[PDB]
């Protein structure tokens, strides 16, 4: 593995494992699907509105 | 009421710029300052020569200008050689030798600038102000298009209020981002006022 932080590398490795492990025996192909491990997780930006301070906080607002 | 520039909000859909050249990050502010003043100075030199739109280019340490007109013969002028004094001074406010190109407008009363001088020249010649637009619309839909809006402000009473008149034909369209329109704003300065005019022409999506 190369690039990213070790918790991001765990996100790459955990699906790189199942792309091989589902060929390892026919009796694993349903079982990894029954657990949700054969698909990319649904996380993606999620990047701030123009302009919020940092993810949220409309900078010095608190209005009304 | 909320509004935005109707050509500048559509410019992000595959269109080029009318100021179309390259410059380095330190010379860009100077190459832009010369682009603005050649467009100003040249459209003023040709202010009675039936001009519509301009495009600026830069050949190797030169400047290139194309001007669109409905009378090319009076811009190229005497013997077809009367152009040197028309590149002479744009070269002196650009700091580089200038090159001329002239382009003919071939459906003139369907161009957003030349139709605005056409209705300016009817408001000048004292037509009915709240009905002037119907002639320009008839003459434009004779040349092509899918829809047209030309809007007049001032002298529309009765009372002298913020009233505007244009009349509905086809689509404006108020939106459609890929609408591929032709747009201009003009002032007639007739009838003791400013007499503000705006025009939108629709020919079909992209």
């Amino acid at each position: 593995v190369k690039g990213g932080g070790i918790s991001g590398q765990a996100g790459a490795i955990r699906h790189g494992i199942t792309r091989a492990l589902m060929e390892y025996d026919e009796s694993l192909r349903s079982e990894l699907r029954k657990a949700g491990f054969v698909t990319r997780d649904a996380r993606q930006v999620e990047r701030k509105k123009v302009g919020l301070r940092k993810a949220r906080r409309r900078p010095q607002f608190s209005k009304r | 009421g909320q509004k935005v520039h109707p050509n500048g909000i559509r410019l992000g859909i595959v269109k080029p710029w009318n100021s179309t050249w390259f410059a380095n990050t330190k010379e860009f502010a100077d190459n832009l300052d010369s682009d603005f003043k050649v467009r100003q100075y040249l459209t003023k030199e040709l202010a009675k020569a039936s001009v519509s739109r301009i495009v600026i280019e830069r050949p190797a340490k030169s400047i290139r200008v194309t001007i669109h007109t409905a009378r090319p013969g009076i811009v190229i002028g005497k013997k077809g050689e009367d152009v040197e004094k028309l590149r002479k001074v744009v070269a002196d406010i650009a700091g580089v030798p200038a090159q001329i190109n002239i382009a003919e407008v071939r459906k003139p009363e369907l161009d957003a600038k030349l139709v605005a001088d056409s209705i300016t020249s009817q408001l000048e010649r004292r037509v009915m102000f709240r009905r002037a637009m119907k002639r320009a619309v008839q003459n434009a839909m004779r040349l092509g298009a899918k829809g047209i809006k030309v809007e007049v402000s001032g002298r529309l009473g009765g009372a002298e209020i913020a009233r505007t008149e244009w009349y509905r034909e086809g689509r404006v369209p108020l939106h459609t981002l890929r609408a591929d329109i032709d747009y201009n704003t003009s002032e007639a300065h007739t009838t003791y006022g400013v007499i503000g005019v705006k025009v939108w022409i629709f020919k079909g999506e992209i």
Partner: protein
């Protein structure tokens, strides 16, 4: 060897220029590879875009500089002379290098 620094501010203008210079090279018999696209370089800012105060009106803008090199590896001269005086789509800049 020669490289040609073809630069633009738009991602289609540089493809429509590549479709002129690489076709001129192939039709003039030049031995050429697939030209590299290079990592895009950017300039960006976020500023108060209202005419007088109104402090909420802060908005983001960005502009992108695209560059290609074309890269000719072969020492042949007649095959590439057709590129050096060639006209390309308006608004691109060219400079010749090693």
């Amino acid at each position: 060897r020669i490289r040609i620094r073809l630069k633009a501010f738009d991602h289609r203008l540089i493809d429509q220029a590549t479709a002129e210079i690489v076709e001129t090279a192939k039709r003039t018999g030049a031995q050429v590879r697939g030209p590299i696209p290079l990592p895009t370089r950017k300039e960006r800012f976020t500023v108060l875009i209202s005419p007088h105060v109104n402090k909420d009106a802060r908005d983001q803008y960005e502009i992108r500089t695209h560059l290609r090199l074309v890269d000719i590896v072969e020492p042949t001269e007649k095959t590439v002379d057709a590129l050096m005086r060639l006209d390309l789509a308006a608004g691109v800049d060219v400079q010749i290098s090693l």
